[PDB]
UniProtKB/Swiss-Prot annotation, chain B:
Residues 1-442 are extracellular. This is Metabotropic glutamate receptor 1. GO terms for biological process: cellular response to electrical stimulus; chemical synaptic transmission; G protein-coupled glutamate receptor signaling pathway; G protein-coupled receptor signaling pathway; L-glutamate import across plasma membrane; locomotory behavior; phospholipase C-activating G protein-coupled glutamate receptor signaling pathway; phospholipase C-activating G protein-coupled receptor signaling pathway. GO terms for cellular component: dendriole; G protein-coupled receptor dimeric complex; G protein-coupled receptor homodimeric complex; glutamatergic synapse; nucleus; plasma membrane; postsynaptic density membrane; Schaffer collateral - CA1 synapse. The gene is GRM1.
Length: 445, 442
């Protein structure tokens, strides 16, 4: 009985977005979700509607075959995503040709385990886990976002650029830190790099554990000034805090993964200790054409997004008479107010274009000379569509070239930043790692 | 379509058994399974039929409610088990009231993630993962086999019985080793035991890693003679082989989890360095009544088991397309016969289901003969509650019950590797750990 955002067309593309937060602890068994989300939820629902409209109006891509949608809420939760994925396949047990999403790797894995049983290709836009490259387990999965293994690669390229042969290695416990570090250490051993102090830090580690980590790192100075951190941001923060307690500054060169990236909250109150840090993050340029569409949406005319009323009330802290807020909505409020575009918007859009390019390629091969769908695509053969998707390529929404390797994995493009004192402290852009190629301003770093 | 072993009844019990081995590597995408299995497969299918027959004949348990079955093949594989679990619920898209199995914890987790969405209770007979006690994730899961956390408890009770105050600790990387050792350490930190050297290793790690392990261990001597190993067998083997390469013997007292248990392949070739080792394993008392039924099965009579002809041909190497001889239907099941070591648990899991149903009936249909409107259909969330509160005497005389997390009591054998009063190295039975009570003989 959960809401579904729909658009009819010749071929239906499924999607799972986090329209709401996960069930609160108490709401878990009933699968009742948390509050509505804009950036991970409403913005993505809307980007999908608008992208399908653009593809449909495009005479060059799928000229005679229209795309529709069936967009479901994952609530950033494995149980709900699975419940909703069953809804995709329920009638078969218009079928969906493939699925965009869900957002997180643990949830994407749950969904893939179901989808693959029905030969439904799945294209992720933000799931970066290294496990998902395993095609013996996840045959039907592919993605337009780089695997975290390319972080390990980039960080090692940075180390090698400056001719270091020893480094220390710290990671956070859990899939993200451990598999990222495992990838780094595997490459390091192949390429002549030696590990000094190695440590795995728990999510709940106290000040004493951090104190000790700092002691172990300082023991290897000065031979191992470089500390490679495949770390969640609060692991980095715990190290900075230990530095403060000991009263030491600037002994190390910290190289951090995107758990740290350019997050102010990691270094707030500890800028002096963090200064000099090198970090990476996914490149994600804003998509202007999304803003042009989204910022113009109106409560009264947006009928196709069934969650838009719930959103409008939350967004403008108001109520629609006929539940928590005093103000009565006018419908004339401005979405520009405090507006921030989903940082992953470009990947969401490219994943949808990817689905469209796979279908076009399928049509060229299976229905040559036939206007629109032919019998060979009635219904669409998911196993064949997977093959076509993997071999598809195109220029994505920000000018980058989108394509997939044999494992369904994407190329990687990261920004390299260096925390610096300015005249405030800023994460200064010092270069990029672009599809295997590191480029850094050595002078600025 | 994959075969299904069925039996009609008023209430249908699902089951997933490893009737076949998992798909060979090249078969994985088509979900075509490996070869037929006896102990993990065919025996379990049969025990389920016969147990249901026995319950249905019983005048006291479920008087005028017949239990049926829909037994499916998991092929010891997440993907196949999930495909088959989807088949169970296809009805809702006679419904299944609950599910027995599958065998492995990682496969059981995958099945539970699907079953819980349809409020179908699931009872495991061999999935021992500590993870499965998390009722926020696995609300509809319960089991008649002890969580591996009770191995850690039993191991600590052994350590304390001998007044040891310091131990070293080794575990295999991954869920089994890490979760077992986390439990042990958590208990040790509550009860005055100190950990000297602590280490983790993969089974596939090289000799250089085991060299470093043993080197690191020997440094914490002479005060840390005892090594607690929550280890898969090949981790123990990696340590025994590092011991030979250094030429050391009898310097440690090894206390091993059921990864080691009484396995010959762990110690073969290293009997002398493994000697004196202490291990535990789940008790598995043989079920006489299963032997009496199973050993009398005939190819021509057994029509309800669709896998029986495939099993017969493989068991007696004949045809009815790989072997030359034609099966008579007369060959004896008693040759090289071994009963599934988990047979007691399989049966108890089935009885647990029946008792849950009975208790639901007593409460919801009080005084009624057979199913009343309140149990048409069976409300899975209610049945879960009734299962959790059920208790009964199991097939071997043990008391079966569940705590609030669906977890079972634990009974382990304790064994000691010894040089016998002959000239052979044997795993000798030295005691038991019975539901919190440690009993050892000198
Ligand atoms: N890329 C994410 C997150 C990525 C990650 C990958 C694998 C396992 C854990 C894990 O958690 C962290 C933690 C810190 C930094 C990056 C990750 C994904 O879940 O795939 C991202 C969609 C999730 C989101 O936006 O929250
Ligand atoms: N109890 C098992 C095995 C148990 C285990 C539990 C959790 C994770 C891994 C894991 O692997 C090991 C390794 C060594 C010793 C015991 C275990 C289960 O999978 O639950 C059961 C399937 C095994 C069977 O029936 O053969
Ligand atoms: C590292 O060594 C290389 C090769 O000798 C040299 O070209 C370069 O100057 C060094 N790199 C940096 C960043 O100093
Ligand atoms: C919204 O704006 C329109 C156009 O300016 C105006 O006529 C109308 O009164 C406004 N509605 C509300 C509820 O303020
Ligand atoms: Mg078009
Ligand atoms: Mg009866």
């Amino acid at each position: 009985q959960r809401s579904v955002a729909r658009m009819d067309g010749d071929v239906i593309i499924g999607a799972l977005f986090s329209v709401h937060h996960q069930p609160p602890a108490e709401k878990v068994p009933e699968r009742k979700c948390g509050e509505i989300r804009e950036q991970y939820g409403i913005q993505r629902v809307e980007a999908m509607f608008h992208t399908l409209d653009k593809i449909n109006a495009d005479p060059v891509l799928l000229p005679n075959i229209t795309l529709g949608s069936e967009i479901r809420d994952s609530c950033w939760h494995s149980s709900v995503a699975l419940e909703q994925s069953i809804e995709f396949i329920r009638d078969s047990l218009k079928p969906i040709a493939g699925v965009i999403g869900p957002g997180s790797s643990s949830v994407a894995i749950q969904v893939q385990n179901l989808l693959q049983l029905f030969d439904i290709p799945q294209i992720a836009y933000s799931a970066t886990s290294i496990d998902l490259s395993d095609k013996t387990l996840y045959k039907y999965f592919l993605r337009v976002v780089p695997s975290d293994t390319l972080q390990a690669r980039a960080m090692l390229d940075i180390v090698k650029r400056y001719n270091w042969t020893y480094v220390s290695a710290v990671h956070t416990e859990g899939n993200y830190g451990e598999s990222g570090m495992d990838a780094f250490k595997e490459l390091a051993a192949q390429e002549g790099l030696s590990i000094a102090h190695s440590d795995k830090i728990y999510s709940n580690a106290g000040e004493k554990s951090f104190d000790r980590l700092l002691r172990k790192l300082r023991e290897r100075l000065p031979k191992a000034r470089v500390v490679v951190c495949f770390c969640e941001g609060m692991t980095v923060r715990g190290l900075l805090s230990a530095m403060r307690r000991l009263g030491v500054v600037g002994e190390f060169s910290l190289i951090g993964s995107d758990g740290w990236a350019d997050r102010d909250e990691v270094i707030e109150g500890y800028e002096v200790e963090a200064n000099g840090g090198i970090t990476i993050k996914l490149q994600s340029p804003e998509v202007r054409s999304f803003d042009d569409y989204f910022l113009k949406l109106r409560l009264d005319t947006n009928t196709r997004n069934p969650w838009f009323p719930e959103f409008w009330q939350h967004r403008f802290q108001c109520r629609l008479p006929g539940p928590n807020f005093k103000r009565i909505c006018t419908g004339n409020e401005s979405l520009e107010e405090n507006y921030v575009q989903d940082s992953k918007m470009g990947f969401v859009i490219n994943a949808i274009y990817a689905m469209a390019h796979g279908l076009q390629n399928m049509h060229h091969a299976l229905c040559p000379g036939h206007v629109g769908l032919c019998d060979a695509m009635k219904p669409i053969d998911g196993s064949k569509l997977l093959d076509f998707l993997i071999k598809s390529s195109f220029i994505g929404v920000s000018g980058e070239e989108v394509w997939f390797d044999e494992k369904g994995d994407a190329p990687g493009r990261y920004d390299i930043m260096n925390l610096q004192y300015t005249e405030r402290y800023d994460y200064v852009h010092v270069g990029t790692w672009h599809e295997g190629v590191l480029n850094i301003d050595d002078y600025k770093i």
